[PDB]
Amino acid sequence: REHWATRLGLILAMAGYAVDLGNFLRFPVQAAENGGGAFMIPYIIAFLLVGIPLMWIEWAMGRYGGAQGHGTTPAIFYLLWRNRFAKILGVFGLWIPLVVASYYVYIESWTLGFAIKFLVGLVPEPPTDPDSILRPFKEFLYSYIGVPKGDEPILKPSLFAYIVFLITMFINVSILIRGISKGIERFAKIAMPTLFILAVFLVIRVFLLETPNGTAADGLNFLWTPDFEKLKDPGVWIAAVGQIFFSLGLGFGVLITFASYVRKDQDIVLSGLTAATLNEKASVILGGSISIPAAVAFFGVANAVAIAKAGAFNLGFITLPAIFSQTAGGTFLGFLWFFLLFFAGLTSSIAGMQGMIAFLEDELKLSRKHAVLWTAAIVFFSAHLVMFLNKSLDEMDFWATGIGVVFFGLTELIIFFWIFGADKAWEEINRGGIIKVPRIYYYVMRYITPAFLAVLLVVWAREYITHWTVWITRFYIIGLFLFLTFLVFLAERRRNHE
Ligand SMILES: CNCC[C@@H](Oc1ccc(C(F)(F)F)cc1)c1ccccc1
Ligand code: NA
Ligand code: NA
Numbered sequence: 001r002e003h004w005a006t007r008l009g010l011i012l013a014m015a016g017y018a019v020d021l022g023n024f025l026r027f028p029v030q031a032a033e034n035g036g037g038a039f040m041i042p043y044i045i046a047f048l049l050v051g052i053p054l055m056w057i058e059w060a061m062g063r064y065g066g067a068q069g070h071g072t073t074p075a076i077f078y079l080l081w082r083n084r085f086a087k088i089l090g091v092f093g094l095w096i097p098l099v100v101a102s103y104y105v106y107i108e109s110w111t112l113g114f115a116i117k118f119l120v121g122l123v124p125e126p127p128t129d130p131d132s133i134l135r136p137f138k139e140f141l142y143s144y145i146g147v148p149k150g151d152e153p154i155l156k157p158s159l160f161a162y163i164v165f166l167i168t169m170f171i172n173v174s175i176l177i178r179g180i181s182k183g184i185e186r187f188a189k190i191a192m193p194t195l196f197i198l199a200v201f202l203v204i205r206v207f208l209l210e211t212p213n214g215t216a217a218d219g220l221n222f223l224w225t226p227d228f229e230k231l232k233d234p235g236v237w238i239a240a241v242g243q244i245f246f247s248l249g250l251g252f253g254v255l256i257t258f259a260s261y262v263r264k265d266q267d268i269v270l271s272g273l274t275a276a277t278l279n280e281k282a283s284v285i286l287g288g289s290i291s292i293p294a295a296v297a298f299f300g301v302a303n304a305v306a307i308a309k310a311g312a313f314n315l316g317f318i319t320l321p322a323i324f325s326q327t328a329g330g331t332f333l334g335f336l337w338f339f340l341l342f343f344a345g346l347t348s349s350i351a352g353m354q355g356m357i358a359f360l361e362d363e364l365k366l367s368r369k370h371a372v373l374w375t376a377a378i379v380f381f382s383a384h385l386v387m388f389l390n391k392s393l394d395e396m397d398f399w400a401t402g403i404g405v406v407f408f409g410l411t412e413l414i415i416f417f418w419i420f421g422a423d424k425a426w427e428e429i430n431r432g433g434i435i436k437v438p439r440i441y442y443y444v445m446r447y448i449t450p451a452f453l454a455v456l457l458v459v460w461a462r463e464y465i466t467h468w469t470v471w472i473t474r475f476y477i478i479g480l481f482l483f484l485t486f487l488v489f490l491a492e493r494r495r496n497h498e
Protein backbone atom coordinates (compact mmCIF):
# COMPACT_ATOMS: atom_id res chain seq x y z
CA ARG A 1 0.00 0.00 0.00
CA GLU A 2 1.10 3.55 -0.85
CA HIS A 3 1.95 6.11 1.84
CA TRP A 4 2.59 9.81 2.41
CA ALA A 5 6.31 10.58 2.15
CA THR A 6 6.68 13.52 4.52
CA ARG A 7 4.61 14.80 7.43
CA LEU A 8 4.59 18.20 5.74
CA GLY A 9 3.33 16.74 2.47
CA LEU A 10 0.51 15.01 4.34
CA ILE A 11 -0.63 18.24 5.98
CA LEU A 12 -0.28 20.25 2.76
CA ALA A 13 -2.28 17.65 0.82
CA MET A 14 -4.90 17.69 3.56
CA ALA A 15 -4.87 21.49 3.65
CA GLY A 16 -4.92 21.49 -0.15
CA TYR A 17 -8.16 19.55 0.05
CA ALA A 18 -9.77 21.78 2.71
CA VAL A 19 -8.81 25.08 1.02
CA ASP A 20 -11.01 25.45 -2.07
CA LEU A 21 -13.06 28.35 -3.46
CA GLY A 22 -15.27 28.18 -0.37
CA ASN A 23 -12.56 29.84 1.70
CA PHE A 24 -12.45 32.89 -0.56
CA LEU A 25 -16.06 33.23 -1.67
CA ARG A 26 -18.58 31.29 0.45
CA PHE A 27 -17.12 32.03 3.88
CA PRO A 28 -16.99 35.84 3.47
CA VAL A 29 -20.62 35.95 2.27
CA GLN A 30 -21.93 33.79 5.13
CA ALA A 31 -20.17 35.95 7.72
CA ALA A 32 -21.48 39.26 6.36
CA GLU A 33 -25.07 37.99 6.30
CA ASN A 34 -24.87 36.50 9.78
CA GLY A 35 -23.61 39.22 12.11
CA GLY A 36 -20.31 40.08 10.45
CA GLY A 37 -17.75 39.67 13.20
CA ALA A 38 -20.35 38.31 15.61
CA PHE A 39 -20.57 35.32 13.26
CA MET A 40 -17.21 34.28 14.73
CA ILE A 41 -18.92 33.25 17.96
CA PRO A 42 -21.06 30.40 16.57
CA TYR A 43 -18.39 29.60 13.95
CA ILE A 44 -15.60 29.08 16.48
CA ILE A 45 -17.98 27.12 18.73
CA ALA A 46 -18.94 24.79 15.88
CA PHE A 47 -15.26 24.46 15.01
CA LEU A 48 -14.64 23.08 18.50
CA LEU A 49 -17.77 21.01 19.05
CA VAL A 50 -18.30 19.73 15.51
CA GLY A 51 -15.45 20.34 13.07
CA ILE A 52 -12.45 19.34 15.16
CA PRO A 53 -14.06 16.22 16.71
CA LEU A 54 -15.34 14.98 13.34
CA MET A 55 -11.96 15.55 11.68
CA TRP A 56 -10.08 13.40 14.18
CA ILE A 57 -12.63 10.63 13.70
CA GLU A 58 -12.33 10.45 9.91
CA TRP A 59 -8.55 10.60 10.34
CA ALA A 60 -8.86 7.73 12.81
CA MET A 61 -11.16 5.60 10.65
CA GLY A 62 -8.96 6.22 7.63
CA ARG A 63 -5.73 5.17 9.31
CA TYR A 64 -7.49 2.25 11.00
CA GLY A 65 -8.80 0.93 7.69
CA GLY A 66 -5.68 1.87 5.74
CA ALA A 67 -3.65 -0.43 7.97
CA GLN A 68 -5.79 -3.30 6.69
CA GLY A 69 -5.60 -2.40 3.00
CA HIS A 70 -8.95 -0.60 2.90
CA GLY A 71 -9.20 3.14 2.35
CA THR A 72 -12.88 3.36 1.39
CA THR A 73 -16.03 3.50 3.53
CA PRO A 74 -17.83 0.39 2.17
CA ALA A 75 -14.93 -1.75 3.40
CA ILE A 76 -14.10 0.36 6.47
CA PHE A 77 -17.69 0.45 7.76
CA TYR A 78 -17.66 -3.33 7.49
CA LEU A 79 -14.57 -3.38 9.69
CA LEU A 80 -16.04 -1.08 12.34
CA TRP A 81 -19.35 -2.92 12.02
CA ARG A 82 -19.49 -6.44 10.59
CA ASN A 83 -22.88 -6.07 8.91
CA ARG A 84 -24.51 -5.89 5.48
CA PHE A 85 -26.14 -2.52 6.23
CA ALA A 86 -22.66 -1.19 7.02
CA LYS A 87 -21.39 -1.91 3.51
CA ILE A 88 -24.56 -0.28 2.17
CA LEU A 89 -24.18 2.89 4.24
CA GLY A 90 -20.52 2.84 3.26
CA VAL A 91 -21.56 3.18 -0.37
CA PHE A 92 -22.63 6.80 0.29
CA GLY A 93 -19.04 7.79 1.12
CA LEU A 94 -18.05 6.58 -2.34
CA TRP A 95 -21.15 8.10 -3.87
CA ILE A 96 -20.89 11.65 -2.50
CA PRO A 97 -17.41 12.61 -3.77
CA LEU A 98 -18.36 10.99 -7.08
CA VAL A 99 -21.47 13.14 -7.46
CA VAL A 100 -19.61 16.31 -6.51
CA ALA A 101 -16.84 15.55 -9.00
CA SER A 102 -19.53 15.49 -11.69
CA TYR A 103 -19.83 19.27 -11.43
CA TYR A 104 -16.96 20.48 -9.23
CA VAL A 105 -14.24 19.69 -11.76
CA TYR A 106 -16.41 21.43 -14.35
CA ILE A 107 -16.72 24.62 -12.27
CA GLU A 108 -12.97 24.21 -11.75
CA SER A 109 -12.56 24.29 -15.54
CA TRP A 110 -14.33 27.68 -15.59
CA THR A 111 -11.65 29.29 -13.45
CA LEU A 112 -9.01 27.79 -15.72
CA GLY A 113 -10.95 29.00 -18.75
CA PHE A 114 -11.46 32.50 -17.36
CA ALA A 115 -7.83 32.63 -16.26
CA ILE A 116 -6.87 31.86 -19.85
CA LYS A 117 -9.30 34.46 -21.23
CA PHE A 118 -8.03 37.08 -18.76
CA LEU A 119 -4.33 36.46 -19.44
CA VAL A 120 -4.66 36.79 -23.23
CA GLY A 121 -6.95 39.77 -22.71
CA LEU A 122 -10.08 38.21 -24.20
CA VAL A 123 -12.32 39.93 -21.64
CA PRO A 124 -15.18 42.47 -21.99
CA GLU A 125 -14.20 46.12 -21.73
CA PRO A 126 -16.95 48.41 -20.34
CA PRO A 127 -18.40 51.02 -20.68
CA THR A 128 -20.49 55.11 -15.15
CA ASP A 129 -23.16 52.99 -13.44
CA PRO A 130 -22.97 49.53 -11.74
CA ASP A 131 -25.39 47.66 -14.01
CA SER A 132 -23.43 49.11 -16.93
CA ILE A 133 -20.24 47.45 -15.65
CA LEU A 134 -21.65 44.17 -14.35
CA ARG A 135 -23.85 43.26 -17.35
CA PRO A 136 -20.95 42.89 -19.82
CA PHE A 137 -19.49 40.35 -17.37
CA LYS A 138 -22.87 38.81 -16.64
CA GLU A 139 -23.21 38.11 -20.35
CA PHE A 140 -19.54 37.11 -20.52
CA LEU A 141 -20.07 34.34 -17.98
CA TYR A 142 -23.39 33.21 -19.47
CA SER A 143 -21.86 32.71 -22.92
CA TYR A 144 -19.20 30.53 -21.32
CA ILE A 145 -21.66 28.35 -19.39
CA GLY A 146 -24.27 28.53 -22.14
CA VAL A 147 -26.98 29.74 -19.76
CA PRO A 148 -30.43 29.16 -21.39
CA LYS A 149 -31.77 32.20 -23.23
CA GLY A 150 -35.09 30.50 -23.95
CA ASP A 151 -37.59 28.54 -21.88
CA GLU A 152 -35.69 25.30 -22.48
CA PRO A 153 -33.64 23.96 -19.54
CA ILE A 154 -30.76 23.43 -21.96
CA LEU A 155 -27.23 24.72 -21.51
CA LYS A 156 -24.96 25.28 -24.50
CA PRO A 157 -21.36 25.74 -23.26
CA SER A 158 -18.91 27.33 -25.69
CA LEU A 159 -16.47 25.07 -27.55
CA PHE A 160 -13.69 26.79 -25.58
CA ALA A 161 -15.35 26.00 -22.24
CA TYR A 162 -15.63 22.33 -23.23
CA ILE A 163 -12.01 22.10 -24.47
CA VAL A 164 -10.76 23.60 -21.19
CA PHE A 165 -12.89 21.01 -19.39
CA LEU A 166 -11.07 18.27 -21.27
CA ILE A 167 -7.77 19.93 -20.42
CA THR A 168 -8.85 20.35 -16.79
CA MET A 169 -9.75 16.65 -16.60
CA PHE A 170 -6.44 15.80 -18.24
CA ILE A 171 -4.66 17.97 -15.65
CA ASN A 172 -6.39 16.14 -12.80
CA VAL A 173 -5.44 12.79 -14.31
CA SER A 174 -1.81 13.85 -14.81
CA ILE A 175 -1.41 14.43 -11.07
CA LEU A 176 -3.46 11.46 -9.92
CA ILE A 177 -1.79 8.90 -12.18
CA ARG A 178 1.55 9.51 -10.43
CA GLY A 179 0.22 8.24 -7.10
CA ILE A 180 -0.10 9.57 -3.57
CA SER A 181 3.49 10.60 -2.83
CA LYS A 182 4.75 11.50 -6.31
CA GLY A 183 1.41 12.95 -7.39
CA ILE A 184 -0.91 14.48 -4.81
CA GLU A 185 1.78 15.16 -2.21
CA ARG A 186 4.34 16.47 -4.70
CA PHE A 187 1.69 18.80 -6.11
CA ALA A 188 0.47 19.81 -2.66
CA LYS A 189 4.04 20.94 -1.94
CA ILE A 190 3.89 23.25 -4.94
CA ALA A 191 0.27 24.41 -5.06
CA MET A 192 -0.06 25.40 -1.39
CA PRO A 193 2.91 27.79 -1.43
CA THR A 194 1.80 29.01 -4.88
CA LEU A 195 -1.64 29.53 -3.36
CA PHE A 196 -0.31 31.52 -0.41
CA ILE A 197 1.77 33.91 -2.54
CA LEU A 198 -1.17 34.57 -4.88
CA ALA A 199 -3.43 35.17 -1.91
CA VAL A 200 -1.00 37.55 -0.19
CA PHE A 201 -0.32 39.42 -3.43
CA LEU A 202 -4.05 40.02 -3.87
CA VAL A 203 -4.60 40.95 -0.21
CA ILE A 204 -1.91 43.58 -0.62
CA ARG A 205 -3.34 44.81 -3.93
CA VAL A 206 -6.92 44.87 -2.66
CA PHE A 207 -5.97 47.03 0.32
CA LEU A 208 -4.42 49.51 -2.13
CA LEU A 209 -7.76 49.99 -3.88
CA GLU A 210 -9.23 53.48 -3.74
CA THR A 211 -12.34 54.59 -5.62
CA PRO A 212 -14.73 57.55 -5.20
CA ASN A 213 -17.14 55.02 -3.66
CA GLY A 214 -14.83 53.90 -0.84
CA THR A 215 -11.75 51.88 0.14
CA ALA A 216 -10.75 48.37 1.21
CA ALA A 217 -10.83 49.55 4.82
CA ASP A 218 -14.56 50.11 4.38
CA GLY A 219 -14.73 46.53 3.13
CA LEU A 220 -12.98 45.02 6.14
CA ASN A 221 -14.97 47.38 8.35
CA PHE A 222 -18.40 46.28 7.10
CA LEU A 223 -17.34 42.63 7.04
CA TRP A 224 -15.95 42.46 10.56
CA THR A 225 -18.14 44.93 12.49
CA PRO A 226 -20.04 42.60 14.89
CA ASP A 227 -23.86 42.47 14.87
CA PHE A 228 -24.60 40.49 18.04
CA GLU A 229 -28.37 40.87 17.58
CA LYS A 230 -28.24 38.22 14.86
CA LEU A 231 -26.82 35.67 17.31
CA LYS A 232 -30.39 35.36 18.59
CA ASP A 233 -31.22 33.72 15.25
CA PRO A 234 -30.92 29.90 15.28
CA GLY A 235 -30.52 30.03 11.50
CA VAL A 236 -27.17 31.74 12.02
CA TRP A 237 -26.05 28.96 14.35
CA ILE A 238 -27.20 26.53 11.66
CA ALA A 239 -25.36 28.39 8.90
CA ALA A 240 -22.28 28.34 11.12
CA VAL A 241 -22.45 24.59 11.80
CA GLY A 242 -23.14 23.93 8.13
CA GLN A 243 -20.16 26.07 7.12
CA ILE A 244 -17.64 24.24 9.34
CA PHE A 245 -18.83 21.09 7.61
CA PHE A 246 -18.46 22.75 4.21
CA SER A 247 -15.08 24.40 4.90
CA LEU A 248 -13.34 21.43 6.52
CA GLY A 249 -14.77 19.09 3.90
CA LEU A 250 -16.33 16.74 6.43
CA GLY A 251 -18.58 13.87 5.36
CA PHE A 252 -17.18 13.48 1.85
CA GLY A 253 -15.20 10.36 2.72
CA VAL A 254 -12.10 12.13 1.45
CA LEU A 255 -10.42 12.65 4.81
CA ILE A 256 -10.97 8.94 5.42
CA THR A 257 -9.44 7.97 2.08
CA PHE A 258 -6.53 10.37 2.62
CA ALA A 259 -5.83 9.33 6.23
CA SER A 260 -5.66 5.73 5.04
CA TYR A 261 -2.28 6.55 3.49
CA VAL A 262 -1.04 7.64 6.90
CA ARG A 263 1.02 4.83 8.45
CA LYS A 264 -0.45 2.75 11.29
CA ASP A 265 1.37 4.44 14.19
CA GLN A 266 1.90 7.91 12.69
CA ASP A 267 0.35 10.93 14.42
CA ILE A 268 -3.08 12.03 13.25
CA VAL A 269 -4.12 14.26 16.14
CA LEU A 270 -1.62 17.09 15.72
CA SER A 271 -1.15 16.70 11.97
CA GLY A 272 -4.91 16.95 11.51
CA LEU A 273 -5.27 19.87 13.90
CA THR A 274 -2.65 21.72 11.83
CA ALA A 275 -4.28 21.05 8.48
CA ALA A 276 -7.58 22.18 9.96
CA THR A 277 -5.92 25.35 11.23
CA LEU A 278 -4.32 26.07 7.86
CA ASN A 279 -7.78 25.99 6.30
CA GLU A 280 -9.30 28.38 8.83
CA LYS A 281 -6.42 30.85 8.67
CA ALA A 282 -6.84 30.84 4.90
CA SER A 283 -10.48 31.83 5.29
CA VAL A 284 -10.48 34.57 7.94
CA ILE A 285 -7.19 36.23 6.98
CA LEU A 286 -6.82 35.89 3.21
CA GLY A 287 -10.36 35.05 2.09
CA GLY A 288 -12.17 37.86 3.90
CA SER A 289 -9.59 40.42 2.82
CA ILE A 290 -9.91 39.96 -0.94
CA SER A 291 -13.46 39.39 -2.15
CA ILE A 292 -15.66 41.47 0.16
CA PRO A 293 -13.30 44.46 0.60
CA ALA A 294 -12.63 44.94 -3.12
CA ALA A 295 -16.38 44.70 -3.77
CA VAL A 296 -17.14 47.32 -1.11
CA ALA A 297 -14.18 49.49 -2.12
CA PHE A 298 -15.63 49.83 -5.62
CA PHE A 299 -19.41 49.81 -5.15
CA GLY A 300 -19.39 51.49 -1.75
CA VAL A 301 -20.48 50.29 1.68
CA ALA A 302 -23.99 51.31 0.58
CA ASN A 303 -24.23 48.27 -1.69
CA ALA A 304 -22.37 46.04 0.77
CA VAL A 305 -25.63 44.35 1.72
CA ALA A 306 -26.81 44.05 -1.89
CA ILE A 307 -23.44 42.56 -2.88
CA ALA A 308 -23.48 39.97 -0.09
CA LYS A 309 -27.07 39.01 -0.94
CA ALA A 310 -26.09 38.65 -4.61
CA GLY A 311 -24.56 35.27 -3.78
CA ALA A 312 -21.02 33.93 -3.49
CA PHE A 313 -21.04 32.97 -7.17
CA ASN A 314 -21.79 36.43 -8.59
CA LEU A 315 -19.09 37.84 -6.37
CA GLY A 316 -16.37 35.65 -7.82
CA PHE A 317 -17.56 35.28 -11.41
CA ILE A 318 -19.38 38.51 -12.28
CA THR A 319 -18.61 41.16 -9.67
CA LEU A 320 -14.85 40.79 -9.11
CA PRO A 321 -14.05 40.48 -12.80
CA ALA A 322 -16.07 43.67 -13.40
CA ILE A 323 -13.96 45.49 -10.82
CA PHE A 324 -10.62 44.30 -12.21
CA SER A 325 -11.64 45.62 -15.63
CA GLN A 326 -11.71 49.05 -13.97
CA THR A 327 -8.39 48.85 -12.13
CA ALA A 328 -4.85 49.54 -13.33
CA GLY A 329 -3.55 46.39 -15.02
CA GLY A 330 -6.62 44.52 -13.80
CA THR A 331 -6.53 42.15 -16.77
CA PHE A 332 -3.61 40.50 -15.03
CA LEU A 333 -5.42 40.85 -11.70
CA GLY A 334 -8.24 38.80 -13.15
CA PHE A 335 -5.71 36.20 -14.25
CA LEU A 336 -4.22 35.94 -10.78
CA TRP A 337 -7.64 35.82 -9.15
CA PHE A 338 -8.84 32.91 -11.31
CA PHE A 339 -5.42 31.17 -11.23
CA LEU A 340 -5.73 31.36 -7.45
CA LEU A 341 -9.16 29.75 -7.66
CA PHE A 342 -8.05 27.06 -10.13
CA PHE A 343 -5.36 25.60 -7.87
CA ALA A 344 -7.67 25.96 -4.87
CA GLY A 345 -10.04 23.59 -6.64
CA LEU A 346 -7.40 21.47 -8.34
CA THR A 347 -6.07 20.55 -4.91
CA SER A 348 -9.61 19.60 -3.88
CA SER A 349 -10.67 17.77 -7.04
CA ILE A 350 -7.69 15.42 -7.09
CA ALA A 351 -8.40 14.66 -3.40
CA GLY A 352 -11.99 13.47 -3.83
CA MET A 353 -11.56 11.47 -7.02
CA GLN A 354 -9.02 9.45 -5.01
CA GLY A 355 -11.89 7.79 -3.16
CA MET A 356 -13.03 6.06 -6.34
CA ILE A 357 -9.42 5.33 -7.27
CA ALA A 358 -8.76 3.84 -3.84
CA PHE A 359 -11.88 1.67 -4.15
CA LEU A 360 -10.95 0.13 -7.49
CA GLU A 361 -7.40 -0.49 -6.24
CA ASP A 362 -8.23 -1.96 -2.83
CA GLU A 363 -11.49 -3.80 -3.45
CA LEU A 364 -11.50 -4.58 -7.18
CA LYS A 365 -7.71 -4.95 -7.32
CA LEU A 366 -7.14 -2.65 -10.30
CA SER A 367 -3.73 -1.17 -11.09
CA ARG A 368 -3.25 2.53 -10.40
CA LYS A 369 -3.37 3.30 -14.13
CA HIS A 370 -6.69 1.60 -14.74
CA ALA A 371 -8.32 2.79 -11.52
CA VAL A 372 -7.54 6.39 -12.52
CA LEU A 373 -8.63 6.22 -16.17
CA TRP A 374 -11.90 4.48 -15.31
CA THR A 375 -12.57 7.05 -12.57
CA ALA A 376 -11.83 9.82 -15.06
CA ALA A 377 -14.12 8.08 -17.57
CA ILE A 378 -16.99 7.98 -15.07
CA VAL A 379 -16.59 11.60 -13.97
CA PHE A 380 -16.24 12.83 -17.56
CA PHE A 381 -19.44 11.08 -18.62
CA SER A 382 -21.60 12.15 -15.65
CA ALA A 383 -20.38 15.74 -16.01
CA HIS A 384 -22.21 15.99 -19.33
CA LEU A 385 -25.47 16.06 -17.38
CA VAL A 386 -24.19 19.11 -15.52
CA MET A 387 -22.71 20.72 -18.65
CA PHE A 388 -25.89 20.49 -20.74
CA LEU A 389 -28.91 20.02 -18.45
CA ASN A 390 -29.70 23.31 -16.73
CA LYS A 391 -29.95 23.13 -12.92
CA SER A 392 -28.61 19.57 -12.96
CA LEU A 393 -25.64 20.99 -11.06
CA ASP A 394 -27.76 22.45 -8.27
CA GLU A 395 -29.78 19.25 -7.87
CA MET A 396 -26.63 17.15 -7.56
CA ASP A 397 -25.16 19.64 -5.11
CA PHE A 398 -28.32 19.71 -3.02
CA TRP A 399 -28.38 15.98 -2.37
CA ALA A 400 -24.68 15.17 -2.26
CA THR A 401 -23.53 18.19 -0.24
CA GLY A 402 -26.72 19.49 1.37
CA ILE A 403 -27.72 16.40 3.34
CA GLY A 404 -25.47 13.73 1.83
CA VAL A 405 -22.43 14.86 3.81
CA VAL A 406 -24.37 15.87 6.93
CA PHE A 407 -26.17 12.51 7.05
CA PHE A 408 -23.04 10.50 6.25
CA GLY A 409 -21.19 12.51 8.89
CA LEU A 410 -23.57 11.52 11.68
CA THR A 411 -23.41 7.97 10.33
CA GLU A 412 -19.63 8.08 10.79
CA LEU A 413 -20.09 9.08 14.43
CA ILE A 414 -22.53 6.32 15.35
CA ILE A 415 -20.57 3.61 13.55
CA PHE A 416 -17.15 4.51 14.98
CA PHE A 417 -18.05 5.88 18.43
CA TRP A 418 -21.28 4.06 19.34
CA ILE A 419 -21.27 0.82 17.35
CA PHE A 420 -17.53 0.14 17.18
CA GLY A 421 -17.34 1.33 20.78
CA ALA A 422 -16.19 4.69 22.12
CA ASP A 423 -13.25 3.37 24.14
CA LYS A 424 -11.82 1.36 21.25
CA ALA A 425 -12.33 4.43 19.04
CA TRP A 426 -10.76 6.93 21.42
CA GLU A 427 -7.59 4.84 21.58
CA GLU A 428 -7.61 4.66 17.80
CA ILE A 429 -7.60 8.45 17.56
CA ASN A 430 -4.94 9.07 20.22
CA ARG A 431 -2.57 6.23 19.29
CA GLY A 432 0.78 7.45 17.96
CA GLY A 433 -0.34 11.03 18.47
CA ILE A 434 2.40 13.57 19.14
CA ILE A 435 -0.12 15.28 21.37
CA LYS A 436 -3.06 13.56 23.03
CA VAL A 437 -6.67 14.66 22.58
CA PRO A 438 -7.98 16.59 25.62
CA ARG A 439 -9.97 14.32 27.93
CA ILE A 440 -13.03 16.57 27.55
CA TYR A 441 -13.37 15.75 23.84
CA TYR A 442 -14.57 12.24 24.68
CA TYR A 443 -17.93 13.68 25.73
CA VAL A 444 -18.01 16.10 22.81
CA MET A 445 -17.51 13.29 20.30
CA ARG A 446 -20.04 10.98 21.95
CA TYR A 447 -22.89 13.38 22.76
CA ILE A 448 -22.41 17.02 21.79
CA THR A 449 -21.24 16.44 18.21
CA PRO A 450 -23.97 13.95 17.23
CA ALA A 451 -26.51 16.16 19.04
CA PHE A 452 -25.41 19.11 16.91
CA LEU A 453 -25.57 16.94 13.79
CA ALA A 454 -28.94 15.42 14.63
CA VAL A 455 -30.43 18.86 15.35
CA LEU A 456 -28.85 20.24 12.20
CA LEU A 457 -30.53 17.33 10.43
CA VAL A 458 -33.96 18.13 11.84
CA VAL A 459 -33.55 21.81 10.93
CA TRP A 460 -32.43 20.65 7.49
CA ALA A 461 -35.14 17.97 7.33
CA ARG A 462 -37.99 20.46 7.55
CA GLU A 463 -37.53 23.84 5.85
CA TYR A 464 -35.06 22.40 3.31
CA ILE A 465 -37.53 19.55 2.57
CA THR A 466 -38.92 22.56 -9.10
CA HIS A 467 -39.15 21.78 -12.83
CA TRP A 468 -39.70 18.15 -13.89
CA THR A 469 -36.17 18.03 -15.32
CA VAL A 470 -34.77 17.53 -11.81
CA TRP A 471 -35.90 13.92 -12.10
CA ILE A 472 -33.38 13.32 -14.89
CA THR A 473 -30.69 14.28 -12.38
CA ARG A 474 -32.34 12.27 -9.60
CA PHE A 475 -32.61 9.39 -12.07
CA TYR A 476 -28.89 9.57 -12.75
CA ILE A 477 -27.59 10.06 -9.22
CA ILE A 478 -29.78 7.21 -7.98
CA GLY A 479 -28.45 5.10 -10.84
CA LEU A 480 -24.94 5.85 -9.63
CA PHE A 481 -25.73 4.56 -6.14
CA LEU A 482 -27.11 1.33 -7.62
CA PHE A 483 -24.00 1.02 -9.80
CA LEU A 484 -21.69 1.48 -6.84
CA THR A 485 -23.77 -0.94 -4.78
CA PHE A 486 -23.14 -3.46 -7.54
CA LEU A 487 -19.37 -2.91 -7.51
CA VAL A 488 -19.38 -3.40 -3.75
CA PHE A 489 -21.29 -6.61 -4.40
CA LEU A 490 -18.71 -7.66 -7.01
CA ALA A 491 -15.99 -6.62 -4.57
CA GLU A 492 -17.17 -9.07 -1.91
CA ARG A 493 -17.78 -11.87 -4.41
CA ARG A 494 -14.20 -11.64 -5.67
CA ARG A 495 -12.95 -12.06 -2.09
CA ASN A 496 -14.85 -15.30 -1.35
CA HIS A 497 -13.21 -16.96 -4.37
CA GLU A 498 -9.66 -16.10 -3.27
C1 LIG B 1 -12.76 21.27 1.35
N1 LIG B 1 -14.01 21.78 1.85
C2 LIG B 1 -15.12 21.24 1.10
C3 LIG B 1 -15.41 22.07 -0.21
C4 LIG B 1 -15.56 21.10 -1.35
O1 LIG B 1 -15.20 19.81 -0.99
C5 LIG B 1 -15.03 18.93 -2.10
C6 LIG B 1 -14.74 19.44 -3.33
C7 LIG B 1 -14.59 18.58 -4.40
C8 LIG B 1 -14.73 17.23 -4.22
C9 LIG B 1 -14.55 16.35 -5.42
F1 LIG B 1 -13.73 16.96 -6.30
F2 LIG B 1 -15.73 16.16 -6.04
F3 LIG B 1 -14.04 15.18 -5.04
C10 LIG B 1 -15.02 16.71 -2.99
C11 LIG B 1 -15.18 17.55 -1.91
C12 LIG B 1 -17.01 21.21 -1.83
C13 LIG B 1 -18.06 20.92 -0.95
C14 LIG B 1 -19.39 21.04 -1.40
C15 LIG B 1 -19.65 21.45 -2.70
C16 LIG B 1 -18.60 21.75 -3.57
C17 LIG B 1 -17.26 21.64 -3.13
NA1 NA C 1 -12.39 25.31 3.35
NA1 NA D 1 -8.25 22.77 -2.68
